[PDB]
């Protein structure tokens, strides 16, 4: 279902083609549109390193303490940007399931209908939306100046924006993603809704 | 010499907690933050925290956004020529209108309490005090 997603990604780097015992590890927290994605798309870097299909358990413990909505039952992180932002699949039987985009730089949450086909095929390959929804316009620029990242690295601000940092490229440093996101999730209490 | 100096010793409450190579990376990255903060003036840091907090503005709002963003996905899967974010958001927005406090904030408070804690510290003066925060050594296990 994600041909139109995979094609617009130039320079992909699959780090681990996806199993089935892997997919069954998350049956309690996943959904079929995401299980078929793990079937069509393996864990790796996509769209020039901007996007990282991750092992959910790398982050799932970090972010399940995150209050997004009343009656959330589980948050399943399945993707990360090159800045440490987190995409999670959220099970919620009062509101209906949905995807949350957690902007780790601005400490905000974006509620996205759980239409993985729309998300991966028509929102991601659309620069308007990379800018409008995810604030990733300056990815090319940042990489020109700071360098390219591996799969488990990202661009951190030091100090982060939440701890009074500037947001200039002077403060960006390639660092290990998972401890970065952990750090940032411990700084901000509530990821408030993104003015959008 | 002939100078007056304002010298601030704040810890982050609660301390950062932790649950091999991982603890190395986090002490390492917390110090980097800790050092990056102490290079900032009180004035700088607070102008940056104000800038950060002006990002982000509910069951009804999320219900509103639910309806709007579900419509855009409809338009978008239907057509095969992409839409522009600025256009399509305003489109659906007028369709609907036709039927319509953790660690970093504690740090900002701990600090703001110092700056007012007599003698009160003024905005111009803030351009001349260096941050003095310690938190990386407090990493609980």
Author numbering:
A (entry chain B): 1 to 196
B (entry chain A): 173 to 180, 182 to 192, 199 to 236, 241 to 283, 320 to 360
What did the article's authors report about this structure?
Crystallographic snapshots of isolated Tde1, the Tde1/Tdi1 complex, and homologs from Phocaeicola vulgatus (Tde2/Tdi2) illustrate a conserved mechanism of immunity inserting into the central core of Tde, splitting the nuclease fold into two subdomains.
When bound to immunity proteins, Tde1tox and Tde2tox split into two subdomains. Tdi1 and Tdi2 form extensive contacts with the conserved central cores of their Tdetox counterparts.
